[PDB]
C-alpha cells in the first residue's frame, strides 16, 4: 500500500474496488465516517455493496475495459500532464497506443471527470 | 413505582448474540451504532410508548436480517439486554482478565481486548 | 397482492422522506401493512426495513393486522368522556365481547377510541364508515350495534 | 487555544471550548453517570443520568449534550441532581425482570458464587 | 338571493350534507335559479344545521334546520319574500347574544365565506394583506409590523412571533422553511381545523407573508390525515391561489416564489412538538431531539425552519391590514390581541369563541356559554388539555392571558376550554389525562416513558379502592420529578392535571383514599346503586334493560338489586323515570 | 483562606490589600494575568503598588474607618439582603449600630457601589 489508513479521512475523493465493505466491515464503516467527514465515494464493484449509500458514482463492471476506456478519456479531456509523466514514467507512448482504439463510454467519461475534477 | 412489568424475552437459535427485551432500558445505543457506525442498520423501535421494543427487521430474527453479525449491539449495550455469547461449553458470569491484541482475520488489523479466565 | 403498489412507490420515488406518505397510499390499497408490502417498499424505496418497521409500529394511524368490515371510532376526547363517554365504550365492548382497538371473530366490527370528532356539541359521538352517531347512551349505542346487525343480517 | 474556565465540584477547570460537561468531567476524573451516551454517536437524552446541576438555570441540564461555557458553575452530586438520578433508576428498575445474583449465591451465608464456579 | 350551508366537520356531523342535498333538489324540482354554498363553522355549533339566507346584505340564520322544515323555509323564503321568523335563529341586524361579546380576527371570515371559492374570500377583503406587503413593504418591516402588533404563539407556551420569524431570517442558508402545526393534538380541542375548514386562505395568506419576512421559498402545512374535509379544503384553496398567480412562482407578478405542499401527519400527539414534527416531516419516525441545533437555526433537513400554529397565521393578515398598533390595542400589557377557544363539556353553549385577552374567565362561561348544562353547580375549567390544568370556581376571575393562567397552575394551550361541573370526579379526569399521555408518548426517556405509567398506576389504583395511604406525597413527589427531568415537552406538562387537581381538590383525593368513597360518584369501584323500596312501582324496564339481568322483582312490586352481580353501568338512572334508584 | 488560587483567573473583581505585588511578585503576575482575562482589579494600600496599573480603583487608606464607611455605604444603598444575612451571621444588629454614626466618604461610597455590582 502507497498510503496509510489515517489519510483516508482527509482525502478528498474515495474510490473503493471490489467488495472492500463486504469483506472487511470495519473499512465499510471507515468508508461511512470518511464520507460523512467529507469525501466522496466512488464504488467500482460488479455487485451491490453497503458502500453504495453514499456514493455519488456507482459503477457495474464486469471487464478491465472499463479503466482502459477512462485512461483514453483522461487523455481526450487534456487531464494528463504529459512532462510530468514522462520525467516520472516510462511506457507512456504504450500506454497511448494501447488505449487509443478503445470506446469511452458515458460511465467511464464520468469516472474520468471525477477522477480529474479531484 | 412498582406495576405492570412486560415479559417478552423469547429464546433464539442465534450462535453469537442473544437479546432479552425484560433487561432493556431503552437507551437506542444498539440502533443506534447499527445505523451510524455498523451501517448495517439492522435494529430498530417498534411499537411506541411503554410498549417500545427493540427489534430487528420486521421482527425477524437476528440471521434472517442483513445484520452481519459484528457484534457492535451486545458490546455497546450497557445493562445485558444485548450480550454476546461466550465461546465455551457452558455459559457462566465470570470476572476476567483482558490482554490487548491483533485480529489477525484479514488485513485491516483491528484490535481487540481478549478477555479471559484460566 | 404486491402489484398494485408500483404507481403509488413510482410517484413517491427518488427521496427517503416520502416514506410516511407511501405506507398510507399502503394502507389505503390493502387496507392494511402487510409485510411483503413493506420488504417490496424498503427494497425500492431504499429505506432499511428496520426504519419501516419502526414507522408502521410508532403512528396509531398504521395497524398491522386485517380490519373487519365496520370500523367503530369511538370518540374518546375529553368534551365527550366528560359527558360519560367510557361507559359507552364499556357497552360496546360488552356487546361485542372485544377489547378496545380489536377486531371480532366473525371479521365486522373493529372498535378504536379516536380524539374529537369535531362534533362535541353531540357528545358521546362514535362513527360508523362515514355515518355519525351523537348525544348517545350505553343502552342507545348497544340499540345501535343491534340495528346494524339485524339490519346486515336481513340482507 | 482558547479556554473556559468552569467550575465542576468546588474544582476550577481551564477547558476547552466545544466541549460537553460529560467529556471536561471525564478528563479532570469526576465520574457523571451516563447510560445513553457514546462518543460515537450523536447525543439522545434518553436515560437522564447525567443530569447536572449548573448555576443560573433553573432546569437541571443533561451533561451528555450541554456543552461548557465560560465562567460555569456545574454541581454533579447536588440534592437535587442526587434525587434525579434515583428516580430515574427506580424508573428504570420498574420495567427490569432478572437477577443480577443467582438464589443460591443469595443462599449462602458467605455469598459464594456458587453459579460462578458450578 | 342566496343560502349557503354550514358544511363544518360538525356540520356534516349534525347532517348539515343531507340538508343540502334537500335543499339542491326542493330547487330543482321547483325550478329555481339560487345559488347554493357550503360555509365554515360561525361558531354556533350547538344550532347546526345552519342555512343563512341572504338578501343584498341581510343575512338570516336559521338553525337546527330539518329536512322537513327547508320546503318550508324556500316556499316562504326564497318564494314568498318574507322571512319565516319563526324557526329563525340569528339575523344580521339582530345577532345571538353568544355572538356581541366576541372579538374576531382569527375567525373574521369564520362561517361568513365560502371556503371553496377564492372569489369570496378576495371580496371580503381578502389577500390585500399579500398585495401591500409585497408593493410597498419590506421584509424588515413586516417583521416590525409583527413585533408592535404583540402577536404571540396563540396555541403554544407563548413565544413573540416576531421573534421567531427575526430568528430564522437572519440564519444564514439558501433554503429556508415555513412550516404551520395544522396538528391539533388536545383530544378536544378543534379550533385549527374549523379555521381550515372555514377560512383556509387566511392560514395561506398568513404563511405567504411570513415566508416574505423570513425569505422562504417552500412551506409545508403539517395536517393530520384523520381530517379529510380540512385537506380537501386546503388543496382547494391552494389550487385556487394558485391559479390566481397568488402562490407558487412569480406571486403578484413580482421576484417572490413561495409554494406550500401538504405533509399529512400519520397521527401522534408528539408529533405536535417542533422537533418532533420536523422528524415526522423528514420521513424519521416523530422521536423529539435534543434542543441544540434549535429548528429557527437548523430545522427540515438541516435549513431554518419556522413553525407557527395556525391561529397565529391567521392572525397575520388582520395585523398588516389594520396596522401593528391596532391589534396592539386590545387586552392586556402583556397578552394582545384576541384568543380562540374552543367551549366543550358542561356548558350550556359550547363551540368556537375568540375573545379578547384579559376577558375573566367567568365572562367566557357565564356570559358567552351561557353557564352550565342543566343549570348544575361548577367546579373546574380545564384550560389546556393533557397538558393544562384545572382552574376552580374560585379562581374563576382569571382574566384570559398568559401569565395569569400560567400563574393558576394552567396553561394557555391551544386553547381547549373543558367545563367540569360538580359530577365530574377530578382523579377520575387526571387518570384519564395521564392515560391519554401515556398512550402518545414517545417512548424514549425513561421520566416519560415509566413516570407517566407508574402515575396513572397510582391514579388507576386511586379510583379502582385499592389506593394504599401514602399515595398523595408520593404522586406528588412522580409529578415534580417528571416535570423536572423529561426530554420534551410532552412529559414536561403532563403531570400538569395531576399537579393541578392536588392543589385545589385535594379534598377529593382524600375522600377516595382515606374514606374510599367518591364525591362526585363517578368512579365505579366506590359508589352504590341501591333502590329504594318506596319509590320504585315496579315497572321492569330497568330490570330489561341490565346487561347483567342484576334487577329482579314481582310486578308492581319493589325491584331488588344484585350487587353481586351489578357491574355499575348506571342505566338504571337513565332508565328509571321515577327517581327510585339511588346512586351513592 | 477560603478560596483557591486558581479561581483567581475566573472571579469577577479582584480586591488586593497590601503590598501583595510588593512581597509577592508571582502574585502580582497573577494579578496582571487574571486582569488581562477580564477581572476587575482595585487595589487597597497606604502607598503605591505595581498593581495600580490596571486598577479601576485605587485607594490611599490609613485606617480601618474606611472599611466602616464602606459597609454603611452597603447598607445605605440596601445592597445586603438582611433576611439572608440573619440566618447565616450574627452580631448583625450589632454591626448596624457600629456602623451608623461613621461618615460616608466618596471613595468609600465608590468602592461599596464597585462591590455590590460586583
Ligand atoms: C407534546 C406537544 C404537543 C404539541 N402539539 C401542538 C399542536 O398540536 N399544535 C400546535 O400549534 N402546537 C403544538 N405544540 C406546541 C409546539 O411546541 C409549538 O409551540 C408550536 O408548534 C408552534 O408554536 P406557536 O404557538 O408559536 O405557533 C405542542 C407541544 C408539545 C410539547
Ligand atoms: S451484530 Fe452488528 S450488524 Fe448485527 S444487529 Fe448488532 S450491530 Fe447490527
Ligand atoms: S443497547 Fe441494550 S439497553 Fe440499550 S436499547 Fe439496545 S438492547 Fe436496550
Ligand atoms: S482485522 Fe479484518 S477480520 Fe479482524 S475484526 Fe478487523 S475487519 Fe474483521
Ligand atoms: S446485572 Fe444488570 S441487566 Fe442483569 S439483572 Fe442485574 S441490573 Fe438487570
Ligand atoms: S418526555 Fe421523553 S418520552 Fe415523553 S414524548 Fe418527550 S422525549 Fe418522548
Ligand atoms: S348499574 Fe347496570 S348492571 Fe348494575 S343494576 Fe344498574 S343496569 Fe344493572
Ligand atoms: S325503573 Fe324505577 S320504578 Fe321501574 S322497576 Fe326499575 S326501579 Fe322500579
Ligand atoms: S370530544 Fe368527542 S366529539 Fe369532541
Ligand atoms: S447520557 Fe443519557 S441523557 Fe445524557
Ligand atoms: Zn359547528
Ligand atoms: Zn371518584
Redesign the pocket.
Known sequence: STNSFDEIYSTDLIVAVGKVAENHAVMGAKLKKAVELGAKLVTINNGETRADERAIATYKIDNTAFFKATIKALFEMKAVDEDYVSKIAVNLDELKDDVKNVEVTDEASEFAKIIAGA | LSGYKHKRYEPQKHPFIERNPDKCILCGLCIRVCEEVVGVCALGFVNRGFETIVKPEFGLPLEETSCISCGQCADICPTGACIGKQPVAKQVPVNTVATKTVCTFCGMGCEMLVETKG | DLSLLDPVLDEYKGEKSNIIAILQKTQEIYRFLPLDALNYISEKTGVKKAKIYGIATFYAQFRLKPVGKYVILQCQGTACHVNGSEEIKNALCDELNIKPGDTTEDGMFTLEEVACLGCCSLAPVMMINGETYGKLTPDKAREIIRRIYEREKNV | MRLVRVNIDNKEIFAEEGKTILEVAHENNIEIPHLCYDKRLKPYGACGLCVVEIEGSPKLARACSTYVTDKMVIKTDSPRVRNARKMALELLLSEHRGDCRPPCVLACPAHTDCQGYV | MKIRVGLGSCGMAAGGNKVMECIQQELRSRNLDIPVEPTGCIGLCFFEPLVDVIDGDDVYTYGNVTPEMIPKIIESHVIGKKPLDEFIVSTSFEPYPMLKSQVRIALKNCGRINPEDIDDYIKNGGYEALKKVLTSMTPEEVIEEIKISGLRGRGGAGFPTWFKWDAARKASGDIKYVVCNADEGDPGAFMDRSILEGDPHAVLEGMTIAAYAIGAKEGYIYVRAEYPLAIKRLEIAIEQARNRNLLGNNILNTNFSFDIKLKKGAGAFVCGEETALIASIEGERGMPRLKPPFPAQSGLWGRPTNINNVETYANVPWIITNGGKAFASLGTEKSKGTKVFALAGKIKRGGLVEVPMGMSLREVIYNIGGGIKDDKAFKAVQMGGPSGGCIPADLIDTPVDYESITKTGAIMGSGGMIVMDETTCMVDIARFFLEFTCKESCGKCTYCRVGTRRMLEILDRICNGEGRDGDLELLEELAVSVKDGSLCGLGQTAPNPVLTTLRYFKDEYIAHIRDKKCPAKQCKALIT?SILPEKCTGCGL?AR????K??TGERLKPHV?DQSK???????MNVCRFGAVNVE
Chains 1, 6 share one sequence.
Open positions: 346503586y330497568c334493560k341490565c346487561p347483567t342484576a334487577i338489586i351489578c357491574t355499575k353501568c348506571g342505566t338504571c
